[PDB]
Design a protein around this ligand. Sequence first.
Ligand code: HEM
Ligand code: HEM
Ligand SMILES: C=C(N[C@H](CSC[C@H](NC1CCCC1)C(=O)NCc1cccnc1)Cc1ccccc1)OC(C)(C)C
Ligand SMILES: C=C(N[C@H](CSC[C@H](NC1CCCC1)C(=O)NCc1cccnc1)Cc1ccccc1)OC(C)(C)C
Lengths: 457, 457
Amino acid sequence: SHGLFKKLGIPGPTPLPFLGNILSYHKGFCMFDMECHKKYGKVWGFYDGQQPVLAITDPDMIKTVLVKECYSVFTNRRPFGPVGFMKSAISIAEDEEWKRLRSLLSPTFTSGKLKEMVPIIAQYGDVLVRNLRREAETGKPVTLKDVFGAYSMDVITSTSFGVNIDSLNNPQDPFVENTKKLLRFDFLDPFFLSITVFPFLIPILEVLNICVFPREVTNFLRKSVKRMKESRLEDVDFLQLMIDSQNSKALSDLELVAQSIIFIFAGYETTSSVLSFIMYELATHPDVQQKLQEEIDAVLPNKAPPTYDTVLQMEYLDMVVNETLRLFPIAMRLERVCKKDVEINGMFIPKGVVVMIPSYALHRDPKYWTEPEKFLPERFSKKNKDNIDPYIYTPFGSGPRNCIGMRFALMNMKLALIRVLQNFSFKPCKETQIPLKLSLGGLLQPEKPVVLKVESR
Amino acid sequence: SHGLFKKLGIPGPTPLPFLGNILSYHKGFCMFDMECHKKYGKVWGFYDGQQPVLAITDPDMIKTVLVKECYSVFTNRRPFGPVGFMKSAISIAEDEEWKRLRSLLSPTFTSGKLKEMVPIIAQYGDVLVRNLRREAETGKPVTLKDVFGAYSMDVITSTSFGVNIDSLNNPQDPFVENTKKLLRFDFLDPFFLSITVFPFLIPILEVLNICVFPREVTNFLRKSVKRMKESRLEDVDFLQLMIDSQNSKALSDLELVAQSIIFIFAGYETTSSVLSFIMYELATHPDVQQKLQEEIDAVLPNKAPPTYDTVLQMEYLDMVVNETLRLFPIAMRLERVCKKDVEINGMFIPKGVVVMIPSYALHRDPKYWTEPEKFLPERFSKKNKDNIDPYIYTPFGSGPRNCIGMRFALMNMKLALIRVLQNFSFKPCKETQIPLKLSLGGLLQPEKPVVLKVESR
Ligand code: HEM
Ligand code: HEM
Ligand SMILES: C=C(N[C@H](CSC[C@H](NC1CCCC1)C(=O)NCc1cccnc1)Cc1ccccc1)OC(C)(C)C
Ligand SMILES: C=C(N[C@H](CSC[C@H](NC1CCCC1)C(=O)NCc1cccnc1)Cc1ccccc1)OC(C)(C)C
């Protein structure tokens, strides 16, 4: 099965029996993609175990794949390990079902519903600040993914179930506990590599009701949600919107829970990780930090509370965000399974092949980015923003299966930063990893957690 | 493979292909054993999946199995699911290795080392009491396995690593968290039944570094212990004793950790569960409660602090304990794998057969116990204690592979009760499950958690 790309005349690294090329993940996904990109060019193929994966780097062709042919051919992602009842979550479902879920859930993530979510996201901004100042006045360097996680948690809990925790001060609350155990899967830990040399074990683990979503976290939320559904009904958040939806093809009950669980993860270690990266940059780039706090004071004088509207009135802030997402696209890769034999942009691609877009690699490709390793937000200036190909820069994917939560994430994030730079400036500690090396793991997160210094303006 | 016992002319329930008799676990292990015991008599066999299990109820024969032939034939328990590096813990190791571990670890559990452990076990008695009185003065019915667990935790943490937590007030402490996730395996949950219809999947999960001991709890303790070992060395608890041992065949480092992890579980949900049962009895039997608080006041006047010595001076207290253990032997069953063809007490038993002693069933067998469903501690009076066959009553097993921690458990437990009945009396609430129905699950724990009323003497 390792002859495939040789036949198609597509170049790539020589696979080992059974292993395919996975030994080459010893420096993380990202480093492997850049290296293939340099060595082979615009297209290459390789083998996660026996599985052909075809990498592509042409924007037309990438558009063809994420847009033009999404429904017909490229509808789904690759399977990755036993998910149990979580089979039914939107990010994991296939074909007509996913097509369906997207619809049931899409209204929920509208700008308009989002704007109603703003003042709740506001209140925990106050918590974040107050918690920070306690560490600021005790001049002790601060690990971010803690205080940001604690914030990221409060937001989720509240924005999706109305649960109102100071999680940084109550990691004791059974709710907060469960919710944390939902962490970014280390796709390069002992498990998933084995899942990829031995995917024939996925059904094995399914019938064994083994689940990558801790059977306890899920058995908790499942019945947790079942209590909420029956206390609201009858006596603004995601659950409401989703409960409203199934009040008609309409969403189910177990289905509803598994969606919640997705939303819960997503907004947690992603929102948390990204902010960490941003403060790392804001910290190792004092001028950018300052220009930012200048925007926030001119659009919002006197430490004025942000509204929905004033947030989007802030362009530089957006630039910084975008630029950070370029440097750290926490997905690293987009993928779609080729469900039929197809020709796209004059290239034959056979069924079962997994088509991959190496986002990380593209973001640091010299050919589109001057000095791509540098952190330069002016890349995304209203002037320069026009020159950036949407199929090269894809922090949130693209097409019918892009990040459904994109607007909410950006709003969520921006809301925190604004309230954080209104009060504090962030400075590198002797202990701050400079330069920030990347987790050679299967996560896009830093090698070492970001520690900085926090001062009260 | 389902013909075995029919050939040997040994009676038992008819197995279904693949399933064996496991459909008959729908009412828990215990109920199935009593039923086989009544229906077939002194011996019977059945099939957990394709695995022959031979049950026996003859004391001679049970002695033969747990004692006389332990080394030669019956050295090990049955495998149960993927344990990863935990392969090396004493309760799980096989043959010469276990034989070895027992020796390295046996001194640790001496009465004499135990006596030095007493005053530490004392101090958290004070915590237990103070926490209780807070709920006592707020006349709100109390779930036991919480406050007892919280106690059971404090003891372990301290008695094995010197870690000194008020865990009831700090379930936030990363240590306490990890430690809790080590809970009594529900052998009748979705997993282990599948493990028993599909044991050929155990090696499957091994190579997948999948572990029944949460890979995170273990990766925590592993490095947690590695920090302690290197802070003590160089600058009274189980770790010390074990560290001392490997200071010579001597214990290893990973080995040392996996032992700790065992000790940690054992003293947790076992100590916790047992006390829960005892207060349930003490509660549904006011007179027994009173006689007890009378012993504790005569051997220890003026709420006198218990010493090692005064504890064993208390006989009734011991009786109550024993009697409770009769009613609720939390192991339910003892097992040993027959590693060779052998004849014992005039019975042929083939290799690979799993020999089982149905402790629960024996404890409620009428033929040894008058009114066995009743709770009557006078059964264990210094007068009557002589009539109890040690091979019928086996709460802690027997022979070279009995409960290594037996003395410590009994001491641990007794120390708590004494300090608890010195201050409080325990009364049934309208909500108290009366009579206490048993978890039809694979655990010996109650159907419903015990809730009682707590009053300040
Ligand atoms: C900065 C934060 C986030 C980033 C960078 C991000 C990025 C992504 C990416 C790269 C994808 C793959 C899309 C594709 O294949 O084209 C995706 C999918 C998805 N995202 Fe996010 N995301 C973020 C936050 C969130 C949040 C807060 C939610 C809340 C629900 C969310 C929900 C989803 C869902 C449900 C999918 C799968 C959508 C589908 O298959 O229909 N994401 N995201
Ligand atoms: C009331 C509490 C406890 C009860 C009822 C209990 C009961 C048992 C039983 C029934 C066995 C099986 C023995 C056999 O097959 O003959 C056992 C084994 C064992 N117990 Fe416990 N136990 C208790 C507490 C503890 C504690 C606190 C420890 C602390 C380390 C401990 C450590 C062990 C170990 C290490 C084994 C396996 C011994 C070996 O295979 O060599 N137990 N226990
Ligand atoms: C392969 C996935 N995830 C899906 C299929 S598994 C469910 C998924 N997370 C899981 C893992 C953590 C607990 C929930 C999701 O959907 N989480 C919401 C989310 C995450 C990140 C960004 N936005 C939303 C397909 C996919 C792959 C990459 C990026 C996005 C989706 O991702 C990881 C590499 C595992 C992090
Ligand atoms: C089958 C076992 N356990 C051993 C083999 S797995 C390791 C074992 N617990 C594990 C499970 C919870 C986290 C540690 C042990 O050794 N825990 C110490 C202990 C427990 C209870 C009483 N004393 C000591 C063999 C065995 C079976 C029954 C009773 C005792 C030992 O037990 C259970 C039915 C699973 C509860």
